[PDB]
């Protein structure tokens, strides 16, 4: 199964260098007829091809980047890398590694993407507060409950409920930037009212930049 896996820091200071690596599994870079590439997607925008590399080490770059981009390939480790120097806020984006077979009809295989934020602000882990179910959050035989994930930087956080067993009716809202410069979001879920006594509801919050892992039980 082809998998393209991005790794690298999620926060880069302005004027510093953005570095990412793609680890390829399910196929070999060495001897292949593919272009191994990076494509980015800034917030609220479309897809921008950055550059590509052949297994020989030959590279091709988007002139938009003004020679700021270097690609390299490590055929021994079956990885290829992106280096973007002198970044600023316009370089904040989701970065995908990708591959395309050579020729006019070649299509792209994609990685899952990784957010890189360009900012001088420091990392900060979130506080997690319950949004407790109560009579004030019950409609019919349905109760709403959730978790408030407050004051973190940078994005993203991930929220699961009951280790992924609870997915129906989960709404994890897009983060909002507060005046303080920190992000905040809530994740909510609706459940049967009658279940609140027997079922324990836990929101699993992860904020990797701060190594924050929180399992918060949400009680009535």
């Amino acid at each position: 199964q082809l998998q393209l896996q991005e790794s690298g820091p999620g926060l880069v200071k302005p004027s510093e260098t953005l570095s990412l690596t793609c680890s390829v599994s399910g196929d070999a870079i060495s001897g292949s007829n593919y272009y191994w590439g990076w494509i980015r997607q800034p917030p609220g925008k479309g897809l921008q091809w950055i550059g590509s590399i052949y297994h020989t080490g030959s590279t091709f770059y988007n002139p938009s980047f003004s020679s700021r981009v270097t690609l390299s390939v490590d055929t021994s480790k079956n990885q290829f890398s992106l280096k973007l120097i002198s970044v600023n806020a316009a370089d904040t984006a989701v970065y995908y590694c990708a591959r395309r077979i050579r020729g006019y009809s070649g299509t792209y295989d994609w990685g899952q993407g990784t957010l890189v934020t360009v900012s001088s602000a420091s990392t900060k882990g979130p506080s997690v507060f319950p949004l407790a179910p109560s009579s004030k959050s019950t409609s019919g035989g349905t109760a709403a409950l959730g978790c408030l994930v407050k004051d973190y930087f940078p994005e993203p956080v991930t929220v699961s409920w009951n280790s992924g067993a609870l997915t129906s009716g989960v709404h994890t809202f897009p983060a909002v930037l507060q005046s303080s410069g920190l992000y905040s979001l809530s994740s909510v879920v609706t459940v049967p009212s009658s279940s609140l006594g027997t079922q324990t509801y836990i929101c699993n919050v992860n904020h990797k930049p701060s190594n924050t892992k929180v399992d918060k039980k949400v009680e009535p």
Binding site: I39, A132, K136, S137, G146, K150
Partner: protein, 201 residues
């Protein structure tokens, strides 16, 4: 290199509609095109390539077309065309559905957060349509302004509704001033505004 453009740029259509999206190249470099579907929070994924059943491709003049024969709720996504290392700007497809009134829930701040010196009050509007909604915070029957922030989910892939959080953020001191915290919701699906409230006590 070339530029790819798409049309429409954005559209909203009902479940079961036939939807056609166009890709136009500034120069004719290739007879092959591919289309990608990007659902919210996901990487784009290859849909169809003219080089290889609801989805199909064709030619109109020099443009390339992508047709969805019967739009489904899970087709809510942005669609991109591609030739070599060139992408179109994307076409976002929203789902038009029947009006659905929100279910409204309100959450006082937690004791832990109150220990922290800040108070967040959260009002949830769940599973409504269309996206337009008015949430007004009233605190001891006085209307509030400038202390709330709203967040909206993307359209749900199964029922095509939105959910909405409005979060009122106060100092603990400002929270402790007043008694009744109320979220008043106006929406096309409701005859009259719905108010959910609680007493700080």
């Amino acid at each position: 290199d070339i530029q790819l453009t798409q049309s429409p740029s954005f559209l909203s259509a009902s479940v079961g509609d036939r939807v056609t999206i166009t890709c136009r190249a500034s120069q004719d470099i290739s007879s092959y095109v591919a289309w990608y579907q990007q659902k919210p929070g996901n990487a784009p994924k290859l849909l169809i390539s003219s080089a290889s059943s609801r989805f199909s491709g064709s030619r109109s003049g020099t443009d390339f077309t992508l047709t969805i024969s019967s739009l489904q709720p899970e087709d809510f996504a942005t669609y991109y065309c591609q030739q070599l290392n060139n992408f179109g700007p994307g076409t976002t497809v929203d789902i038009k559905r029947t009006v659905a009134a929100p279910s409204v829930f309100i959450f006082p701040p937690s004791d832990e957060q109150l220990k922290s010196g800040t108070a967040s009050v959260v009002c949830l509007l769940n599973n409504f349509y269309p996206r337009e909604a008015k949430v007004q915070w009233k605190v001891d029957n006085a209307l509030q302004s400038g202390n709330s922030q709203e967040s909206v989910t993307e359209q749900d892939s199964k029922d095509s509704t939105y959910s909405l959080s409005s979060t009122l953020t106060l100092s603990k001191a400002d929270y402790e001033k007043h008694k009744v915290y109320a979220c008043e919701v106006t929406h096309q699906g409701l005859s009259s505004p719905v108010t959910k409230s609680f007493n700080r006590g």
